RNA sequence: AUUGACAGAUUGAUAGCUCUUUCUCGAUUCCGUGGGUGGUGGUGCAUGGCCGUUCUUAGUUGGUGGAGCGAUUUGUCUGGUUAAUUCCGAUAACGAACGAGACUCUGGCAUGCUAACUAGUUACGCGACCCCCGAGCGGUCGGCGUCCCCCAACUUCUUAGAGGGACAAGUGGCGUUCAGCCACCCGAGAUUGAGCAAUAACAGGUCUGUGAUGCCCUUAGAUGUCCGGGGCUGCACGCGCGCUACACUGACUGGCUCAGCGUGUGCCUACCCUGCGCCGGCAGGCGCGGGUAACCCGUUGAACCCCAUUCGUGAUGGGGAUCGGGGAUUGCAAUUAUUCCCCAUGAACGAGGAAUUCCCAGUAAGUGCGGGUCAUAAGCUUGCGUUGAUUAAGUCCCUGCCCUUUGUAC
């Protein structure tokens, strides 16, 4: 939930 | 050819060997019982350090003229490690190479300058150039 | 003084004008002192005193001026006749922020109202002509604890390089 | 300079010395081709890098870093 | 008397080195021999010639 | 009325401060009564001055209009965007203003200008040499001079004055075709770092920064001033920032090649930077000089770094804590070792559980070296360098700030 990947 | 187009390490080694072969450089009484630098923890590892350092010193004097005791001590400074405390810088020693520059004076390759310091004589410059040519010839063949 | 370096000369000189500027602030409290400009010449330097009550500065045929040249000569290591002093008047008194302060100080010494004198010294500035002003008084007055209040109107910018030279503060 | 800095200073020196000579005295068609080859290989042969040392700022040993602090 | 009063050698003394306005013996500055406390120069810096351009 | 003193005893005092002895200056003192003094004593919960944090984010105030009986509010907003109520748009707001911004400080550039012996470059007439026929427009010199000179000019490199260049300008894409965001070419650089930084809230800290200060407090057995010694470092234990290393990319020995900011002989203040030469194993000492400074240190020949030898996984020359002896250093003085130089004893230290901090480009980090401190000095601090990479161009998952909707006797 840390914006690591890019439902 | 000049001394620039030859390897500095091999030129110093060749000049040190030439000084050993001649055996006319003045040798102080304290031969192998003193340290070359203040920062060192041990005596010099190999003998003929007097000849090798005199070989390098003559090369530094060739590049830059008018160099005295204060100039030389800046050049040969060493990384002084004081153990627990942060390490600092230590200048080169004084007395030992004063015997070296008296040795060069005895061999007639240095001359006192007009304002101070020692400057290369024709005899010293000629010797440094021919050994440089021999070094280049040896490297080529 | 034939062997003096520039860096220490200007360092002693900057504190030289500062020493006189502070001393004349302490001295001419009732003369409306604002500041001093120093002209330096090899022959004979001159120093000007900026104040509003120039008549009181003279006193009696320059009694205060003549006594001031003597103490400056005796103290600051200057020979006889090497330093001369003059008195000038502030061109725009209202825009000299020091002036409105030394009027307020003597109003506080008299015992005038805190708000009325702040608005009075305020109202004196736009009639002279100014873009903005802000006077703040903080501290204790006939009571406990210390209160700070401000009195500002007009365009009054605090932030930026222009505030360095467009703003005079005391 | 330094050691890597001085080597690159000398390397860029001879490259733009050849470019300047090939600009002023010989055909400019070859001046364009040698410049194009130099740019194709590495642009740093001609450009001076803008990046310089960044002044330290108080509160930490490095310019950007901070001196490690604890609440207790 | 004269051999005891102020008989302590005044030279080479830090406290005896005191600012010419504040007479304080902590945090003296002697760059160009300025004889000026750090905070006292803080307030007169714009007067002496020092301005925080950087 | 006083002040000072030799002599013998105490006291550490060659301190008439005291005890016996007497001498010397003379209205300047002394004794009581009022009354200022001084304080690095206390109060920062009296404070004035400042700095810091909420905050270095994006947030705050009139005139005229609109909503209200009114205190007041809209102006400052569903939405999109930016680091940013900045900007764009629906819109009762329009003009504005404060704060970002903008401005100011240092480095990024023309073969642009002005002109700089307190600097260099190219040559000029030399000398020292190197090969070699006398060779060659040969190759180096920071060795000579081109301010009493005709024995030449110029500023590219060393810096000091002024001007544009980088403004999302040009192409493409996303975007309510608007603000704005990204790829790209030419470009010294397509986000280069810093100072100031709106009102106000801190019972924020400083009375030990001033002859800035209120009040109280010891004032002649002073909490003043004067001297001396002792500790501010003590030591069982816990806490912060930090340095040294736990090794082989290592360390030792010898050689080789590069640095800039910058202080450098002082009113009271004696105390500066150092060069050259000699003596000494080393800190160090002696004689001779330059610099009040682009002129001397200094072409600041600094350190891992580049090369060659040794040790080779052994708490192993490395890690070097603690102790002894010898000597110079600085001042009056070094013991309760300022520090430094040589021989010495030579413990832990196999990268350390939780649990946190700082860091995105010349960054971190290594590694030094200046200035602040100083009689002598740094393991502190601010800066200047040389070497010098990956990680991400994202969110609020954990800890906190901002905005609105806003319960709320606060
Ligand atoms: Mg002080
Ligand atoms: Zn002072």
- Inter-helix orientation angle C6-27/E38-48, to 10°: 100
What is the distance in A from the centroid of ligand 1 to the CA of E38? 9
Strand-pair category, C45-51 with C83-88: parallel
* Structure determined via: cryo-EM
CB-based contact D56:D63 (threshold 8 Å): yes
Residue C51 β-bridge partners: C33
CB-based contact C68:C58 (threshold 8 Å): no
Alpha helices in D1-72 (DSSP H): 4-24, 28-41
C62: helix, strand or coil: coil
Q: Give which of B45, B28, B32, B38 is closest to B97, Cα–Cα.
A: B28
Residue C90 buriedness (CB in 10 A; 0-12 / 13-18 / 19+)? middle
Number of domains in chain E: 1
D63: helix, strand or coil: coil
Q: Give which of C4, C12, C15 to mutate to test E binding, by max E Cβ within 10 Å.
A: C15
Dmax (CA) for chain A in angstroms is 14
Q: Which bases of strand F sit closer than 7 A to a protein CB?
A: 4-5, 13-15, 17, 40, 46-49, 97-109, 111, 128-131, 139-143, 186, 188-189, 192-201, 203, 209-210, 212, 226-228, 239-245, 252-259, 263-271, 274-284, 292-293, 297-305, 307-309, 317-322, 331-332, 340-342, 356-365, 367-369, 371-375, 378-388, 394-397
Resolution in angstrom units: 2.5
Domain that holds residue E31: 1-54
Q: Give which of C111, C1, C109, C99 is closest to C51, Cα–Cα.
A: C99
* End-to-end Cα separation, chain E, in angstroms: 55
C138: helix, strand or coil: strand
């Amino acid at each position: 939930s840390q914006g690591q990947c890019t439902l | 050819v000049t001394v620039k187009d030859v390897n500095q390490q091999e030129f110093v080694r060749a000049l040190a060997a030439f000084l050993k072969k001649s055996g006319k450089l003045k040798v102080p009484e304290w031969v192998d019982t003193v340290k070359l630098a203040k920062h060192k923890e041990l005596a010099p590892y190999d003998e003929n350090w007097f000849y090798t350092r005199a070989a390098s010193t003559a090369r530094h004097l060739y590049l830059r003229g008018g160099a005295g005791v204060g100039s030389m001590t800046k050049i040969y400074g060493g990384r002084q490690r004081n153990g627990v405390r942060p390490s600092h810088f230590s200048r080169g020693s004084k007395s030992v190479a004063r015997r070296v520059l008296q040795a060069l004076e005895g061999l007639k390759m240095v001359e006192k300058d007009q304002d101070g310091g020692r400057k290369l004589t024709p005899q010293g410059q000629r010797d440094l150039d021919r050994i440089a040519g021999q070094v280049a010839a040896a490297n080529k063949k | 003084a034939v062997q003096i370096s520039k860096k220490r000369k200007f360092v002693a000189d900057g504190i030289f004008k500062a020493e006189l500027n502070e001393f004349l602030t302490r001295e001419l409290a009732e003369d409306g002192y604002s500041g001093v400009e120093v002209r330096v010449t090899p022959t004979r330097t001159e120093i000007i005193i900026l104040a509003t009550r120039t008549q009181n500065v003279l006193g009696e045929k320059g009694r205060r001026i003549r006594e001031l040249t003597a103490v400056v000569q005796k103290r600051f290591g200057f020979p006889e006749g090497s330093v001369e002093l003059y008195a000038e008047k502030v061109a725009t008194r209202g825009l000299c922020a020091i002036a409105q302060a030394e009027s307020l100080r003597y109003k506080l010494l008299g015992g005038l109202a805190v708000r009325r004198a702040c608005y009075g010294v305020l109202r004196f500035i736009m009639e002279s002509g100014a873009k903005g002003c802000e006077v703040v008084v903080s501290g204790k007055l006939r009571g406990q604890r210390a209160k700070s209040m401000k009195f500002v109107d007009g365009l009054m910018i605090h932030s930026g390089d222009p505030v360095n030279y467009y703003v005079d503060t005391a | 300079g330094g050691h890597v800095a001085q080597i690159y200073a000398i390397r860029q020196s001879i490259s733009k010395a050849l470019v300047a000579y090939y600009q002023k005295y010989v055909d400019e068609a070859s001046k364009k081709e040698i410049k194009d080859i130099l740019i194709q290989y590495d642009r740093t042969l001609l450009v001076a890098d803008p990046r310089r040392c960044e002044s330290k700022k108080f509160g930490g040993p490095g310019a950007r870093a901070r001196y490690q602090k604890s609440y207790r | 008397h004269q051999q005891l009063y102020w008989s302590h050698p005044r030279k080479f003394g830090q406290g005896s080195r005191s600012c010419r306005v504040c007479s304080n013996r902590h945090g003296l500055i002697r760059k160009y021999g300025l004889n000026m406390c750090r905070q006292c120069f803080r307030q007169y810096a714009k007067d002496i010639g020092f301005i925080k351009l950087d």
